[PDB]
Ligand SMILES: O=C(O)c1ccccc1/N=N/c1ccc(O)cc1
Ligand SMILES: O=C(O)c1ccccc1/N=N/c1ccc(O)cc1
């Protein structure tokens with residue numbers, strides 16, 4: 522509804538998503554940073570009967586037919602409607618590692634998405 | 638195969654998942670704590686072609702806390718890695734965000750960690 | 757040096773700090789949000805021989821002579837100098853809880869500080 | 873008294889601290905992993921008058937990874953709570969931020985969790 526569309530973040534990445542009546546999120550993600558190229562599949566869920574913003578989250582595993590970074594990012598946040606819609610999030614990016622390096626496997630950040 | 642199955646965290650929550658050959662995660666989650674009752678749908682992704690150096694397999698999934706019985710107006714995302722072996726595990730870090738007004742946006746997200754096992 | 761001074765964040769809070777030659781950080785914090793009133797003591801450390809931004813962190817326990825919220829926040833980030841100095845951070849706020857509620861003890865966020 | 877002492881995390885790092893009556897934490901930290909060698913100074917704060925309902929005691933501390941021997945140009949902050957008893961513990965979540973250029977600021981901070989015990 523308000524969620525379905527094309528969005529961009531401060532890094533220049535692109536998120537295209539469709540919100541299903543059943544609370545599913547499906548689309549593709551195109552990243553401006555890291556070891557990535559071309560599009561990647563995304564899947565997520567959202568509150569389909571919100572009351573405040575609308576809670577949602579989605580994941581991307583950084584593997585496609587061209588590259589594999591052996592990592593995955595999860596974005597957790599809320600959708601805020603109005604004139605200028607926005608998705609405020611915090612993310613976790615975890616890399617596959619050996620046991621010895623597991624302590625440094627996860628990065629944390631925050632991204633804000635603007636609807637086109 | 639490795640990931641596909643029924644898992645449990647430290648709180649006693651149950652995670653039932655199927656890992657597709659293609660990278661998809663699909664299943665149901667039942668929580669032991671919080672404003673929840675019954676099963677909830679989950680969706681996620683994982684690295685279907687991990688490295689061959691003994692590294693873990695990266696993955697992540699989301700659950701929106703709404704079902705036929707209740708709605709907490711929130712969602713959690715888990716990000717981590719699957720570590721195979723005799724006693725397999727999924728080590729994660731999670732973020733739970735609630736829908737809030739602007740005045741409360743500063744305290745909308747909780748952070749934690751969960752360890753899943755087959756027992 | 758560049759760090760010593762008065763700073764403000766997006767919430768309207770105030771951070772007054774002095775950076776010691778030995779890498780110590782000392783000052784007071786005045787919060788615009790939560791269960792807080794008047795000033796609170798802060799203590800931290802910073803890289804006294806940086807190369808990029810300057811790594812630093814500080815803590816505040818939300819107890820003073822007037823109120824006690826039974827909680828503490830830790831800010832971890834980097835100092836970026838220039839015309840307009842800034843401290844970019846991510847924080848963790850943990851509340852004292854019973855065993856049963858420990859899973860919901862910690863909040864995570866991000867704050868940007870501007871130097872006055 | 874409860875907090876004051878020598879503690880160890882899961883990685884084998886050593887945390888030696890003194891808790892002042894007033895809310896101060898002061899001590900030294902020795903890391904088992906990462907770009908570190910020897911002891912590092914730490915500083916923090918804690919709730920000197922916790923609640924009487926069986927709740928934990930909130931606390932936090934920072935370490936900047938620079939000493940007489942090396943400098944990693946980074947700092948970690950731990951935030952958590954002390955839980956007294958026969959087998960006392962300090963449960964935490966931590967953030968490690970490295971000094972980076974603007975181009976790398978997106979990947980400057982790592983997140984994790986540590987459990988400290990007296991053994
Ligand atoms: O692009 C973002 O918006 C983005 C935002 C948050 C976290 C990660 C991100 N991207 N992370 C990668 C990682 C490995 C790659 O191979 C490609 C992208
Ligand atoms: O249940 C876990 O395993 C679980 C694990 C990690 C983070 C959160 C959790 N659960 N958080 C809730 C929130 C709202 C509810 O209505 C039910 C559960």
Ligand SMILES: O=C(O)c1ccccc1/N=N/c1ccc(O)cc1
Nearest residue numbers: 769787788789790791792818825829
């Ligand atoms: O004010 C900030 O900048 C601030 C920024 C991040 C996290 C917490 C903050 N403040 N958190 C409190 C908590 C309890 C209180 O009693 C008073 C303030």
Ligand SMILES: O=C(O)c1ccccc1/N=N/c1ccc(O)cc1
Nearest residue numbers: 885903904905906907908937944966
């Ligand atoms: O040592 C721990 O217990 C530890 C625990 C939690 C997070 C980080 C840790 N250590 N991170 C480093 C980083 C740079 C160094 O030079 C040495 C250690």
